């Protein structure tokens with residue numbers, strides 16, 4: 223995201239990147255969010 | 271809708287920074303009214 | 310189907326003539342003899358003459374005999390530059406480099422002769438779009454300045470906070 | 481619509497903004513009210529690239545956007561977008577890019593001083609004069625990090641600061657003419 227903002231990347235690129243960043247942060251805080259995908263550990267086991 | 275906010279009066283996405291700036295603009299006295307200790 | 314690919318073939322023959330370089334317009338019946346269209350019915354030819362020949366923009370009509378318009382396609386680099394200037398003035402937009410290439414021999418040399426006056430933009434299909442430069446106003450932008458620009462985001466700034474910043478800074 | 485406002489908008493947009501966006505501002509100048517689809521047709525650019533530029537423009541609120549609903553003859557639902565430039569919004573937004581440009585430069589130099597002078601190669605990190613002199617032992621007679629056991633030189637810090645100072649002066653000269661245009665606008 224920092225590099226995209228530095229380069230002035232596409233607004234939709236930055237929007238999707240911010241969406242993924244928000245997803246990652248919220249998932250780290252809580253992996254049992256209602257009606258949202260679960261973050262696996264590349265082996266099918268949901269992260270704690 | 272999931273983990274994103276939409277403000278509809280027409281309807282636009284509400285980025286976190288907007289809420290951050292609004293909360294910063296909020297004064298300390300209003301925190302007591304809202305039942306949140308400012309300090 | 311019937312009576313469509315034949316028209317397409319005639320139009321392609323016209324392009325082949327233009328790769329030949331025969332500016333002199335030709336008779337439609339002679340074109341049919343060259344393209345082996347005698348078998349086709351006469352009524353379809355008459356319908357083509359009345360409607361399709363006029364609709365086709367590339368085709369032109371002179372002294373009762375049909376041929377391409379030598380004015381439509383670019384012939385000299387100076388005229389290309391003038392056309393670009395007129396298009397910029399009237400908001401037409403740029404023209405496709407593939408069409409300009411088939412129009413004009415050595416179009417790439419023409420663009421090299423243009424140099425700075427002509428601005429070319431790449432396209433995913435590799436087609437090149439050309440825009441005239443503005444002589445009246447010339448400005449230079451440096452990369453560091455553009456970066457210092459780029460970081461700052463007004464979208465972060467809330468409109469009321471905008472008018473508030475002016476009022477705060479006492480002006 | 482006095483010509484002075486148009487002159488300000490043209491000069492600022494042409495000198496201190498992007499060419500691809502200036503292309504759209506040209507359409508905005510040509511017509512006060514344009515359909516979004518008509519803006520697309522005039523622009524002759526891909527929808528995705530145009531929408532990226534439009535999202536940037538929406539964020540900066542350079543041009544105000546409104547939504548209008550009308551019933552077509554066919555009766556199928558249709559959504560119609562209108563974008564039009566507002567001088568009052570544009571003037572403040574532009575002035576705002578301009579103003580924060582300076583706050584950035586001031587913060588950069590505040591940071592240059594903030595950086596610590598002492599730096600030690602074996603350590604590979606910046607060190608406070610505080611930590612350095614504490615690490616120093618009176619019996620040994622020389623200051624020197626306790627941990628790495630090599631001398632510390634501060635000359636390396638000086639160089640980049642001097643380079644930045646030169647850049648700032650060039651920025652001032654380049655930004656010197658637009659202020660007169662701004663003054664003509666306030667007139």
Ligand SMILES: [Zn+2]
Pocket residue numbers: 600601602603625627628629630
């Ligand atoms: Zn050390």
